[PDB]
């Protein structure tokens, strides 16, 4: 086969981090060459074993999940850190293998007249379990006064947008972070390079 990296990496519409898209990929072949030959990517790091080594060292079942975050908060995306995106939005595990691929899409996402399509979760009553999204947009009650679904006092709305325009500085530019995560099982290496 071929693995849909032209359908993931050249995709037209990434969701936000409160409802990030996840694509289980297996039973195809890896095009890991042009990943490095792309070289238009801001923050491109890997784990497990070296990025030059991963061309052939291949995988049972990969999880390709992607979202869009801010140009400042992307350092929060690292396996085992803190900050809002890794606290309540999307959680890398304690022991992780995959690569974090990060670049700017300022010419697409941030629009004049304002981009407010994108969102994120700013609060939750616990830190987030690893790789589990949170689409539950109910009201959290920080203080003890029960708001019970409607908004009110001591309680806030869960979600918030980002503010994207091309009037933003370089630190406030939207990154289309796609994260590749890997594993190994009794299952064979169903996705494997040349």
């Amino acid at each position, epitope marked *: 086969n071929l693995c849909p990296f032209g359908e993931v990496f050249n995709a037209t519409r990434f969701a936000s981090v409160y409802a990030w898209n996840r694509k289980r990929i297996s039973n195809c072949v890896a095009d890991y060459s042009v990943l490095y030959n792309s070289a238009s990517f801001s923050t491109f790091k890997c784990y497990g074993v070296s990025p030059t080594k991963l061309n052939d060292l291949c995988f049972t079942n990969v999880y390709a999940d992607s979202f869009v975050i801010r140009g400042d908060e992307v350092r929060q995306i690292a396996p085992g850190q803190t900050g809002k995106i890794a606290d309540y939005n999307y959680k890398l595990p304690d022991d992780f293998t995959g690569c974090v691929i990060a670049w700017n899409s300022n010419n697409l996402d941030s629009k004049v007249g*304002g981009n*407010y399509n994108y969102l994120y979760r*700013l609060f939750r009553k616990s830190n987030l379990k690893p790789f589990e999204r949170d689409i*539950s*947009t*109910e*009201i959290y009650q920080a203080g003890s006064t029960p708001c*019970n*679904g*409607v*908004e*009110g*006092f001591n309680c*806030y*709305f*869960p*979600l*918030q*947008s980002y503010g994207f325009q091309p009037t933003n500085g370089v630190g406030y530019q939207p990154y289309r972070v796609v994260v590749l995560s890997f594993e190994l099982l009794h299952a064979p290496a169903t996705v494997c390079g040349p």
Partner: antibody
Amino acid sequence: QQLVESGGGVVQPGRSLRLSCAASGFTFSSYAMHWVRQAPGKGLEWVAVISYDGSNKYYADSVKGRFTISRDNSKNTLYLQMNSLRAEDTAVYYCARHATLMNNKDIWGQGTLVTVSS
Amino acid sequence: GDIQLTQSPSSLSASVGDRVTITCRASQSISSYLNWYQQKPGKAPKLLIYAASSLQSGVPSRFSGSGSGTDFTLTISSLQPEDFATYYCQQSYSTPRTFGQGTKVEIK
């Protein structure tokens, strides 16, 4: 982005009239939604909430007429039936949203006239 | 009981380039949960300030909010010929929500 309302009209008192208001651009589903009232020359008076993210319905006890509120979430639409009418409720209604320190989602319908008269 | 609002003054006929302070007072101590609206009569209420201290898209800093607790302030500055309309404050502290009676800024 946009809110549309069911048709207003002249209804005799004591009757009922279901109020439909459909959303567009972004869903009703993730948010709450409200109804408010404007009588001519009178201030904007809040009426009732809806809270889809759990399920709960709060009404103003100032006008406590069991004006029932529920959803059609899959059409991004909301239904409040005008029950136990009385003539001073003759006004225009709006579909509403409140920026509760977090969002900026205050979007308002076009406004339709409910009339309570024989 | 309910939470009473006190919007003062309920009208103020004004002139070009003014700096009008439309006050919305509260019966209780509300943290910042108060808003402001533009309504020319027959329009939709265009939100002006959220959480009583924060501006809004499309609305420049000719409007400017501040206050907390009971006392809330609409700081209209450099009063523009389009800004003459009927305005409103707003609680979101408890249920029920009430709105102010309105303040019509109008040409002298």
